[PDB]
């Protein structure tokens, strides 16, 4: 016997701030590309510089976009530098001014002619972005009702994806997306970040952490009182107290430690895995071509196709908040990596017929909004909240720094490496990618155990009872 209260939903989100604040800054930096190349080229030009070729401004742009993904890594790698010494809910009040600096390092480096700011602040923007990938995932998970985890650590994907939805919006040319207004449209992340640190002082830390970390016991029950509706809160704090006690019996864990020790050894192998069959699915790739196919296809101002897609991106994750807690976790990850390898096929089939049998561009446009679809039931929501759910209250921090930087990193490898490998092998590339989705289907049927619906001790003592 327990609702949802208000002040559940209104804790969770506001934690979510930091994932809306993660995909706009994700997807606000493409629609502005040429304005701001006349920005940078103006800048140089005005301060005595011959004007830049376009090998230069690529150079800048390049390090504009991509030094985002660097702070990203770094960011979420420094998770366990944070969580234990300052709370997790003050952790997010504390990184804001991150995310304050960040956005007036962008807002400003127009009226500043400055070209070294908006590298600066992507820099810092990118730092505040993966602190928040890691923050957000483990407060929900920690402070979540054990039935509704994946369910409400879903909407830390919905974040992500609105975020990416407004961002895009935004960019529109008669919106923020203008030669006059494109420092606001890149210094809007400071408004969330303003908005989050008013409302977080009414958002509890997680019973969790105070009993299990604080062993603050009559105030975690209080909380849970409010947050739950009820005041029999008897199972769960001393399911509270059970965490407490096993983790006050063991050392806690270093990102070296996790992989010496033996339990832990196959959960961190998931949630790497599980990471890499996300940003490894082909996703990318279908963005890329997104635009290209749209325009081939007869849409003369394709980023309002680029928005059609956001919206299925958002649909699809709704969609998988209201099944993980029946379906599982297992169904839903894999149900998304099959569907997938089966349009990307057709996109390797339908580009390679394409301008010989000439409807293929609709087909192939059909293949990629429905690519979306599968990515958002599975690959997409789940390996951000799981980790969560492998690990015990001591290893979660450093379990979440290695999968949330095995995220950023492969994200960014494959940002970079794509561009030749699309070069070489054309259509051929969304082969490839059948071939990775194939086997993380295969990965995930064999090896990822359900977690839906079990206590953090029982998941536990099954990954002890399998490394026995
Ligand atoms: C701004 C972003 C928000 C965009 C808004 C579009 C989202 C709506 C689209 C699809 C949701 C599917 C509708 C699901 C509603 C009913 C599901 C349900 O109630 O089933 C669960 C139930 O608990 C089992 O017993
Ligand atoms: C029908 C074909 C069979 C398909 C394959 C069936 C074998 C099990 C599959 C995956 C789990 C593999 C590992 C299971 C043990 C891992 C640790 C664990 O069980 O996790 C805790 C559990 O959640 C506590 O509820
Ligand atoms: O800019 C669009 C954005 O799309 C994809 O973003 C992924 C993100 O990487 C995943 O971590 C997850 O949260 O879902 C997003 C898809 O909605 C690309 O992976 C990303 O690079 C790209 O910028």
Same mark, same amino acid.
């Given at each position: 016997?327990?609702?949802?209260?208000?002040?559940?939903?209104?804790?969770?989100?506001?934690?979510?701030?930091?994932?809306?604040?993660?995909?706009?800054?994700?997807?606000? $930096?493409?629609?502005?590309?040429?304005?701001?190349?006349?920005?940078?080229?103006?800048?140089?030009?005005?301060?005595?510089?011959?004007?830049?070729?376009?090998?230069?401004?690529?150079?800048?742009?390049?390090?504009?976009?991509? $030094?985002?993904?660097?702070?990203?890594?770094?960011?979420?790698?420094?998770?366990?530098?944070?969580?234990?010494?300052?709370?997790?809910?003050?952790?997010?009040?504390?990184?804001?001014?991150?995310?304050?600096?960040?956005?007036?390092?962008?807002?400003?480096?127009?009226?500043?002619?400055?070209?070294?700011?908006?590298?600066?602040?992507?820099?810092?923007?990118?730092?505040?972005?993966?602190?928040?990938?890691?923050?957000?995932?483990?407060?929900?998970?920690? $402070?979540?009702?054990?039935?509704?985890?994946?369910?409400?650590?879903?909407?830390?994907?919905?974040?992500?994806?609105?975020?990416?939805?407004?961002?895009?919006?935004?960019?529109?040319?008669?919106?923020?997306?203008?030669?006059?207004?494109?420092?606001?449209?890149?210094?809007?992340?400071?408004?969330?970040?303003?908005?989050?640190?008013?409302?977080?002082?009414?958002?509890?830390?997680?019973?969790?952490?105070?009993?299990?970390?604080?062993?603050?016991?009559?105030?975690?029950?209080?909380?849970?009182?409010?947050?739950?509706?009820?005041?029999?809160?008897?199972?769960?704090?001393?399911?509270?107290? +059970?965490?407490?006690?096993?983790?006050?019996?063991?050392?806690?864990?270093?990102?070296?430690?996790?992989?010496?020790?033996?339990? /832990?050894?196959?959960? $961190?192998?998931?949630?790497?895995?599980?990471?890499?069959?996300?940003?490894?699915?082909?996703?990318?790739?279908?963005? /890329?071509?997104?635009?290209?196919?749209?325009? +081939?296809?007869?849409?003369?101002?394709?980023? /309002?196709?680029?928005?059609?897609?956001?919206?299925?991106?958002?649909?699809?994750?709704?969609?998988?908040?209201?099944?993980?807690?029946?379906?599982?976790?297992?169904?839903?990850?894999?149900?998304?990596?099959?569907?997938?390898?089966?349009?990307?096929?057709?996109?390797?089939?339908?580009?390679?017929?394409? +301008?010989?049998?000439?409807?293929?561009?609709?087909?192939?446009?059909?293949?990629?909004?429905?690519?979306?679809?599968?990515?958002?039931?599975?690959?997409?929501?789940?390996?951000?909240?799981?980790?969560?759910?492998?690990?015990?209250?001591?290893?979660?921090?450093?379990?979440?720094?290695?999968?949330?930087?095995?995220?950023?990193?492969?994200?960014?490898?494959?940002?970079?490496?794509?561009?030749?490998?699309?070069?070489?092998?054309?259509? /051929?590339?969304?082969?490839?990618?059948?071939?990775?989705?194939?086997?993380?289907?295969?990965?995930?049927?064999?090896?990822?155990?359900?977690?839906?619906?079990?206590?953090?001790? +029982?998941?536990?003592?099954?990954?002890?009872?399998?490394?026995?």
């Amino acid at each position: 016997t327990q609702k949802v209260t208000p002040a559940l939903i209104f804790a969770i989100t506001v934690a979510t701030i930091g994932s809306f604040q993660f995909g706009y800054n994700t997807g606000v $930096i493409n629609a502005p590309e040429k304005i701001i190349k006349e920005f940078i080229t103006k800048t140089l030009t005005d301060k005595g510089n011959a004007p830049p070729s376009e090998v230069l401004l690529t150079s800048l742009w390049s390090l504009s976009v991509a $030094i985002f993904s660097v702070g990203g890594m770094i960011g979420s790698f420094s998770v366990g530098l944070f969580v234990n010494r300052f709370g997790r809910r003050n952790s997010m009040l504390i990184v804001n001014l991150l995310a304050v600096t960040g956005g007036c390092f962008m807002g400003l480096c127009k009226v500043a002619k400055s070209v070294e700011m908006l590298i600066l602040g992507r820099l810092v923007i990118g730092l505040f972005c993966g602190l928040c990938t890691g923050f957000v995932p483990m407060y929900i998970g920690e $402070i979540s009702p054990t039935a509704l985890r994946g369910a409400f650590g879903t909407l830390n994907q919905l974040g992500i994806v609105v975020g990416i939805l407004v961002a895009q919006i935004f960019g529109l040319e008669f919106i923020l997306g203008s030669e006059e207004l494109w420092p606001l449209l890149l210094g809007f992340t400071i408004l969330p970040a303003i908005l989050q640190s008013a409302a977080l002082p009414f958002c509890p830390e997680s019973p969790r952490f105070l009993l299990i970390n604080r062993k603050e016991e009559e105030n975690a029950k209080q909380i849970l009182q409010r947050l739950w509706g009820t005041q029999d809160v008897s199972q769960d704090i001393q399911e509270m107290k +059970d965490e407490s006690a096993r983790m006050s019996q063991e050392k806690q864990v270093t990102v070296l430690e996790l992989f010496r020790v033996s339990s /832990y050894r196959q959960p $961190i192998i998931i949630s790497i895995v599980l990471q890499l069959s996300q940003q490894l699915s082909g996703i990318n790739a279908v963005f /890329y071509y997104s635009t290209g196919i749209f325009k +081939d296809a007869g849409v003369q101002e394709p980023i /309002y196709a680029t928005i059609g897609a956001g919206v299925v991106n958002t649909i699809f994750t709704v969609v998988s908040l209201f099944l993980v807690e029946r379906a599982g976790r297992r169904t839903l990850h894999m149900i998304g990596l099959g569907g997938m390898a089966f349009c990307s096929t057709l996109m390797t089939v339908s580009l390679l017929l394409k +301008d010989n049998y000439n409807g293929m561009s609709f087909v192939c446009i059909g293949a990629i909004l429905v690519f979306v679809a599968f990515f958002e039931i599975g690959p997409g929501p789940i390996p951000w909240f799981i980790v969560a759910e492998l690990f015990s209250q001591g290893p979660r921090p450093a379990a979440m720094a290695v999968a949330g930087c095995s995220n950023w990193t492969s994200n960014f490898l494959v940002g970079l490496l794509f561009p030749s490998a699309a070069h070489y092998l054309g259509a /051929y590339v969304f082969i490839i990618f059948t071939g990775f989705l194939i086997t993380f289907l295969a990965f995930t049927f064999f090896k990822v155990p359900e977690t839906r619906g079990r206590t953090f001790e +029982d998941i536990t003592r099954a990954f002890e009872g399998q490394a026995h």
